[PDB]
C-alpha cells in the first residue's frame, strides 16, 4: 500500500533529484540546473540535519514515489501575519509521473499545511510551477505580489 | 536640494511610519497594521543596528521625504541564482503623497538595484502593491508564481 513518513537525513540524494526532475519538467534549462546541482545539495545537508529543511515522504511499499519540503522562514511581521516574524514556506512538491492520478501532491499539501498549523504558523507562500497551479487555487492558494528581476545574474 | 542617504539606526520611526503609511493607502485594514505595529518595530531594531536591515532615505533640505528598504535573505540554490544561496529582497518603498511626480521612486529603486549589484547578488524579488507595480515592471520587474496561503492566520 502507499503510506508517507517524515523526511530523514537519509533522504538527501531523493530531495535533490526531486527537485531537479520538478525543476526540468517545468522547463527550467537542463544546464541551469547542472550548475544548481552540488550549490543546493550542500546547501540542503545541514538543514536536513538540524530540521530547519522538514517535509514529508510517500512510499509504494517502502518505495518512495513523491515528497514534499517545508521550512519556516524568518520574515518581517506583515499585514498577513502581523503578530508572526516568520512564514510557512513549501517547495520541492514531486510525484512520479506514472502516479499521478492517486491524489498523491494534495495528500502531501494537505500534511505540509497540517505541519504548518500544529506549528502555529499563520501564513505560508509556495512558487508554483504551472503544472501544480490549478490544484493549488483549488486548495485556497491565492496568486500574491510578488515580481522578480535578475541583478547580477 | 535632493539629497539620498543611506539608512541608520536613527530612523527606526521612519522605515515603521514608511510601512504603516505604505501598506495603508494599498489598503490594508488599519487595525491590522495596528496590531503589526509593535513586532515590525521590535524586528527591525536588532536589523538596523547589525545592518541586515539597509537602505536609503531621500532627503529635501535635510527633511526626509521617502524611503527604500533592502535585505539579503538565504534561500536555497535555485534556478534563477545556481550558484547562490540568497536573493535580494526590496521592501517599504514609501514616497511622500506631495513628491511623487519627480521620479523619487525610480531612483530609490535604482539605488536599492545597484547596491544588489555591488553586493554580488544574482537575483532580486519585492512584493509590489498595485500602484508600484507599473514602475516595476517598466524597470524590467516580472511577476512571479509565488502564491499564498492562510493556515492559523
Ligand atoms: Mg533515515
Ligand atoms: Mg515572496
Ligand atoms: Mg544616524
Ligand atoms: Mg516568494
Ligand atoms: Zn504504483
Ligand atoms: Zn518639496
Known sequence: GMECRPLCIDDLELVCRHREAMFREAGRD????????DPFRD??????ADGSYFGWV???????LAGIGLMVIEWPPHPSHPLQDKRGYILNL???????????????????????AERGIAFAVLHATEMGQPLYARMGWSPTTEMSKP???
Not at 544546464?31 to 546541482?37: E, N, R
Not at 546547501?43 to 536536513?48: A, D, E, T, V, Y
Not at 514531486?94 to 504548518?116: C, K, T
Open 94 to 116: 514531486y510525484v512520479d509521473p506514472s502516479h499521478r492520478e492517486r491524489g498523491i501532491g494534495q495528500a502531501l499539501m494537505n500534511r505540509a499545511e497540517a505541519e504548518f
Open 58 to 64: 510517500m512510499e509504494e511499499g517502502g518505495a518512495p
Open 30 to 37: 537542463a544546464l541551469t540546473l547542472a550548475a544548481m546541482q
Open 151 to 153: 541583478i547580477a545574474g
Open 43 to 48: 546547501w540542503l545537508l545541514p538543514r536536513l
